[PDB]
Amino acid sequence: QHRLDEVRREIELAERQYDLNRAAELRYGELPKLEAEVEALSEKLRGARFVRLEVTEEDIAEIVSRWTGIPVSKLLEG
Amino acid sequence: ERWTQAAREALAQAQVLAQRMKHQAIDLPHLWAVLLKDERSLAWRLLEKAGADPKALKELQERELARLPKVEGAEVGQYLTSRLSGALNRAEGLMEELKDRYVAVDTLVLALAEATPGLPGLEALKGALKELRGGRTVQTEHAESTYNALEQYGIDLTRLAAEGKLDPVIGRDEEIRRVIQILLRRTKNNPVLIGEPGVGKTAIVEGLAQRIVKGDVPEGLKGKRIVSLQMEFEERLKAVIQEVVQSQGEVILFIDELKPALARGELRLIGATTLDEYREIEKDPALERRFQPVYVDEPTVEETISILRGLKEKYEVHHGVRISDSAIIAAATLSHRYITERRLPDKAIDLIDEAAARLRMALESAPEEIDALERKKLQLEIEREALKKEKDPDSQERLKAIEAEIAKLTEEIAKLRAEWEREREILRKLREAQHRLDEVRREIELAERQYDLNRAAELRYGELPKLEAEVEALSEKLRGARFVRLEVTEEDIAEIVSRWTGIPVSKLLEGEREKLLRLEEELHKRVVGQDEAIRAVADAIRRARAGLKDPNRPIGSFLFLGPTGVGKTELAKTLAATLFDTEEAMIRIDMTEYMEKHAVSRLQLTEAVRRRPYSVILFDEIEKAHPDVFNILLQILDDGRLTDSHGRTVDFRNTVIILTSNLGSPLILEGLQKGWPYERIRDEVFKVLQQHFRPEFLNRLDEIVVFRPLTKEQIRQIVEIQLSYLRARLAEKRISLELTEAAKDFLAERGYDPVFGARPLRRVIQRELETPLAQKILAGEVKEGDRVQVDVGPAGLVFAVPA
Amino acid sequence: GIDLTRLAAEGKLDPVIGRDEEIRRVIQILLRRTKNNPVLIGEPGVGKTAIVEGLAQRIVKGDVPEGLKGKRIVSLQ
Numbered sequence: 001q002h003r004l005d006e007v008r009r010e011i012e013l014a015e016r017q018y019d020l021n022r023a024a025e026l027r028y029g030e031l032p033k034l035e036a037e038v039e040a041l042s043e044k045l046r047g048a049r050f051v052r053l054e055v056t057e058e059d060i061a062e063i064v065s066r067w068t069g070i071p072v073s074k075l076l077e078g
Numbered sequence: 079e080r081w082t083q084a085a086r087e088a089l090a091q092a093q094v095l096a097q098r099m100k101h102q103a104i105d106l107p108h109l110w111a112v113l114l115k116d117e118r119s120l121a122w123r124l125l126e127k128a129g130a131d132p133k134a135l136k137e138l139q140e141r142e143l144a145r146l147p148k149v150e151g152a153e154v155g156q157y158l159t160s161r162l163s164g165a166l167n168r169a170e171g172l173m174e175e176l177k178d179r180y181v182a183v184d185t186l187v188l189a190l191a192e193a194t195p196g197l198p199g200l201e202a203l204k205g206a207l208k209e210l211r212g213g214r215t216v217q218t219e220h221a222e223s224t225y226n227a228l229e230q231y232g233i234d235l236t237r238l239a240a241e242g243k244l245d246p247v248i249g250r251d252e253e254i255r256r257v258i259q260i261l262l263r264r265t266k267n268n269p270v271l272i273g274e275p276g277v278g279k280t281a282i283v284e285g286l287a288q289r290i291v292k293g294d295v296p297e298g299l300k301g302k303r304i305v306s307l308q309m310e311f312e313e314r315l316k317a318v319i320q321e322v323v324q325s326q327g328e329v330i331l332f333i334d335e336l337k338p339a340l341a342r343g344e345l346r347l348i349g350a351t352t353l354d355e356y357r358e359i360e361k362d363p364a365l366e367r368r369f370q371p372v373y374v375d376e377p378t379v380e381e382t383i384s385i386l387r388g389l390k391e392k393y394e395v396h397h398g399v400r401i402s403d404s405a406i407i408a409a410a411t412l413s414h415r416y417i418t419e420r421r422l423p424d425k426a427i428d429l430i431d432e433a434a435a436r437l438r439m440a441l442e443s444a445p446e447e448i449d450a451l452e453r454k455k456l457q458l459e460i461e462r463e464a465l466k467k468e469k470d471p472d473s474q475e476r477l478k479a480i481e482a483e484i485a486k487l488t489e490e491i492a493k494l495r496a497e498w499e500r501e502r503e504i505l506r507k508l509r510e511a512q513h514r515l516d517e518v519r520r521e522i523e524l525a526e527r528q529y530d531l532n533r534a535a536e537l538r539y540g541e542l543p544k545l546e547a548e549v550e551a552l553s554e555k556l557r558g559a560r561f562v563r564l565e566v567t568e569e570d571i572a573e574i575v576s577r578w579t580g581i582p583v584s585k586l587l588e589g590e591r592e593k594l595l596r597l598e599e600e601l602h603k604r605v606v607g608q609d610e611a612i613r614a615v616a617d618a619i620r621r622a623r624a625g626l627k628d629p630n631r632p633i634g635s636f637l638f639l640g641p642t643g644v645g646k647t648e649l650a651k652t653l654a655a656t657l658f659d660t661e662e663a664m665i666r667i668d669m670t671e672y673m674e675k676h677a678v679s680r681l682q683l684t685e686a687v688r689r690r691p692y693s694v695i696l697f698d699e700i701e702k703a704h705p706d707v708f709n710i711l712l713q714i715l716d717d718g719r720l721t722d723s724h725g726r727t728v729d730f731r732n733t734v735i736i737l738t739s740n741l742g743s744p745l746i747l748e749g750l751q752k753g754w755p756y757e758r759i760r761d762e763v764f765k766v767l768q769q770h771f772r773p774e775f776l777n778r779l780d781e782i783v784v785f786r787p788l789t790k791e792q793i794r795q796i797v798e799i800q801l802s803y804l805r806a807r808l809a810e811k812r813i814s815l816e817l818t819e820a821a822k823d824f825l826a827e828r829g830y831d832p833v834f835g836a837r838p839l840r841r842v843i844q845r846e847l848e849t850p851l852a853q854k855i856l857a858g859e860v861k862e863g864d865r866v867q868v869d870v871g872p873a874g875l876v877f878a879v880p881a
Numbered sequence: 882g883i884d885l886t887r888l889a890a891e892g893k894l895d896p897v898i899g900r901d902e903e904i905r906r907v908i909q910i911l912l913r914r915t916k917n918n919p920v921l922i923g924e925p926g927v928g929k930t931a932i933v934e935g936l937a938q939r940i941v942k943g944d945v946p947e948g949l950k951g952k953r954i955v956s957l958q
């Protein structure tokens with residue numbers, strides 16, 4: 001994730017004005033490998049023993065319920 | 079050319095002093111007396127910083143003035159003492175010993191310092207002078223020996239005018255002249271400008287400023303200087319006020335929005351404030367006894383148009399744009415008719431400035447076609463990279479190659495891009511010209527002051543001619559621009575106007591003329607039937623404009639008679655919208671409620687009208703009103719004006735007055751059943767009216783329209799137009815709504831009622847159709863884009879989503 | 882003072898999104914001759930500063946028209 005953000009900081013560092021010919025240009029099609037790893041990887045990480053990673057509605061609804069009342073409704077109830 | 083304004087004014091000051099005290103020879107003591115005003119006075123600072131105490135100097139100097147012989151008429155300020163002249167000329171010799179191109183006030187102090195026995199020598203003097211700033215003498219902006227309370231807390235408008243910094247005030251001869259007058263009246267010489275925000279009060283003042291600099295102003299103000307004060311606080315305030323009096327009326331103070339100073343007739347002041355803000359000051363006699371109100375009324379559209387045309391130059395110079403007269407007229411008209419907030423002078427300009435600014439970014443921004451090609455490329459681009467993946471040297475190769483090929487489009491991305499810079503070039507040039515032409519205008523005017531006809535000559539004739547043709551040349555050189563438009567037009571105006579209101583489609587497009595002619599159409603798009611009503615109202619309004627009626631009356635006044643819920647309020651609403659581009663232009667007075675202190679509760683009316691001149695005013699059940707109201711009303715119908723509680727009358731000349739009642743309803747209906755001649759009905763109904771309304775009233779009515787019952791067809795037609803909003807509101811979800819004639823008929827049926835009219839229709843359509851349709855949508859039966867089919871059933875409507 | 886346009890240059894600023902209209906309006910105002918000093922009026926937390934720093938980023942990208950193309954925005958402290 002850190003290797004991808006800095007790169008997104010560099011792709012704009014070239015299209016901004018200079019050296020668009022060198023690297024920054026269109027590694028835009030080779031980087032999905034990262035977006036391919038972080039996924040097939042997180043999937044792997046999905047488990048127990050505190051592999052905590054995903055932040056979901058329940059999580060949100062909970063901290064929200066903590067300031068109000070009952071996720072059973074806040075959430076569920078559509 | 080001469081001496082810097084500073085020193086220049088100092089001399090005039092001394093001169094006027096000589097006169098005041100009735101002296102014959104303008105000697106040094108005079109110059110001292112005026113130079114040594116405050117501890118803050120430069121002459122004081124520089125002198126004290128060199129070893130001598132100014133106070134004693136000023137003290138002893140005034141003593142001499144007091145010991146001077148009193149001459150008379152042609153002997154007053156008769157000449158300059160040898161000493162003074164000598165020093166004055168010696169000041170020039172010093173302005174040379176210093177790169178300073180002019181003779182500043184400090185260099186003048188040295189001279190006098192030399193010329194006067196008992197105080198510091200040039201050694202310590204030039205020192206002190208130097209030890210202050212250490213700069214040169216060439217002031218125009220942010221430059222001026224700022225040690226004076228006025229220079230330190232006030233903007234010299236007469237100076238900005240002198241240098242030609244102030245914008246052209248135009249079209250206010252009276253007000254100005256009036257002020258010119260009041261500024262010479264002994265009793266009350268301090269004129270205060272009373273007016274609404276945005277009307278151009280300040281303009282009047284700065285306008286006056288310009289005249290003074292041109293000598294356009296009479297005697298007694300010919301050399302005056304106007305200083306605008308811009309606010310321990312009182313510590314400095316006093317330092318200012320007490321410094322203006324020492325100038326001896328040679329400096330007029332202008333307070334944008336102190337009493338004892340006036341209690342000496344030594345503090346000449348020009349004010350500016352709100353109405354009541356002046357009425358509050360109309361509570362302290364010490365003031366209102368020496369103040370002369372000058373109510374600056376909001377300019378008219380024509381005037382506003384003139385004013386805009388005045389600044390036309392200036393603005394388009396700064397935006398490097400071209401503001402067509404067309405756009406100017408729009409800015410004035412559209413604002414005066416649909417911008418309820420600010421008042422004319424201002425808002426009209428803001429519109430133009432807002433317009434130009436907008437368009438200016440557009441010009442200096444990348445065109446459309448380019449941005450277009452920019453994407454089309456990136457499209458094929460991402461395809462390339464993704465097209466050169468997985469081998470398959472037969473289907474991805476030829477493509478990968480002919481892809482880069484098609485990527486040749488990059489040529490246009492440069493060709494057009496060249497045609498753009500090309501235009502921008504022409505443009506960068508034109509903007510320059512405008513700048514010259516502007517500089518050249520200040521240039522000339524500056525000559526028609528120094529009388530240096532020399533310069534002024536070649537400028538006005540030769541210079542201005544070319545520049546004016548050069549710019550007009552390039553302007554025209556862009557009559558065609560695939561990527562440029564230096565013009566500011568109505569659309570541009572209408573747009574920024576629409577941005578503050580609603581729909582450019584109308585704001586723009588439709589002109590009063592076009593609008594008034596299609597009036598009957600527009601109205602019928604929302605009001606079914608009641609043709610007689612529409613025509614009458616339409617004709618009245620048309621007859622209104624065109625100028626065939628007393629200007630001191632409402633655009634049109636009517637009395638809607640007939641059944642209930644068959645058009646009246648609708649037409650009133652629709653009229654407001656179609657005529658004034660918004661249903662917000664309506665103002666209702668549910669008379670059936672104002673049965674108490676009515677009169678008082680409307681001077682509310684005046685206010686609504688006050689803020690929205692162009693509006694429809696609807697009075698429900700007029701007969702229920704009490705004689706008291708009819709007076710306010712009648713007063714509207716005549717002279718088209720009204721005096722509110724406070725006093726300031728409100729203008730109703732731009733309003734349409736609709737009055738409803740059911741007085742003739744029964745008889746009107748009866749006349750329709752027995753089917754007797756319309757004329758027989760109108761006359762029969764009129765008699766009734768003559769029994770509840772003062773003839774003065776019935777006679778001042780533009781028309782007495784009679785609404786009639788609706789026909790089954792109309793009712794259906796209403797159902798249709800009623801459905802429209804539903805269709806529309808649903809369209810936001812791509813949902814279509816097709817109904818059976820049976821369904822429509824049903825609604826028409828349940829919707830209309832003999833006594834209630836088409837009032838029920840809404841509730842009905844709501845319950846019979848909307849409620850059910852709602853449940854289906856929430857339940858999911860009706861999704862996005864579906865084409866809901868509605869047909870009749872045993873006791874209501876039924877829905878069906880096609881397969 | 883913090884130089885926003887600087888941070889925007891080095892991709893230091895957070896990606897401000899969805900406020901083109903407000904930015905454009907700010908841009909427009911700066912070009913005016915009568916009133917060129919735009920003030921952002923809004924409730925706390927709405928993203929007023931984002932509008933500004935958003936504008937900052939555009940300047941660094943040349944996304945802004947002429948006359949501001951090279952300008953530098955400094956947030957007084």
Ligand SMILES: Nc1ncnc2c1ncn2[C@@H]1O[C@H](COP(=O)(O)OP(=O)(O)NP(=O)(O)O)[C@@H](O)[C@H]1O
Nearest residue numbers: 246247248274275276277278279280281385423424
């Ligand atoms: N007679 C005029 N000729 C040219 N421009 C004018 C004129 N009157 C007003 N304006 C313009 O309108 C704006 C406000 O003018 P101003 O004279 O200050 O009026 P105001 O009603 O006093 N507002 P304020 O001083 O802010 O309370 C400025 O942009 C002026 O240039």
Ligand SMILES: Nc1ncnc2c1ncn2[C@@H]1O[C@H](COP(=O)(O)OP(=O)(O)NP(=O)(O)O)[C@@H](O)[C@H]1O
Nearest residue numbers: 604605606642643644645646647648796836837840
């Ligand atoms: N001629 C018409 N064309 C279109 N809609 C109409 C027409 N006449 C009546 N209506 C409908 O009926 C309702 C009120 O019509 P309107 O002409 O304002 O009557 P009314 O006299 O003002 N009723 P009220 O103010 O309740 O006593 C609205 O829902 C209209 O849509």
Ligand SMILES: Nc1ncnc2c1ncn2[C@@H]1O[C@H](COP(=O)(O)OP(=O)(O)NP(=O)(O)O)[C@@H](O)[C@H]1O
Nearest residue numbers: 895896897898900924925926927928929930931932
């Ligand atoms: N358009 C945006 N893009 C990204 N983050 C935003 C955006 N708008 C607001 N925020 C977030 O909101 C917080 C404040 O943003 P900021 O631009 O300083 O707005 P503000 O409303 O002006 N705050 P304040 O000065 O306290 O009234 C930060 O945590 C931001 O992440």
Ligand SMILES: [Pt+2]
Nearest residue numbers: 095098099143
């Ligand atoms: Pt005196």
Ligand SMILES: [Pt+2]
Nearest residue numbers: 158163166167
């Ligand atoms: Pt002289």
Ligand SMILES: [Pt+2]
Nearest residue numbers: 436439440905
């Ligand atoms: Pt724009």
Ligand SMILES: [Pt+2]
Nearest residue numbers: 556557558559
């Ligand atoms: Pt052409």
Ligand SMILES: [Pt+2]
Nearest residue numbers: 651661664665
């Ligand atoms: Pt209304």
Ligand SMILES: [Pt+2]
Nearest residue numbers: 668669671672
């Ligand atoms: Pt009433």
Ligand SMILES: [Pt+2]
Nearest residue numbers: 670671673702
């Ligand atoms: Pt009543």
Ligand SMILES: [Pt+2]
Nearest residue numbers: 439443945946
């Ligand atoms: Pt832009």
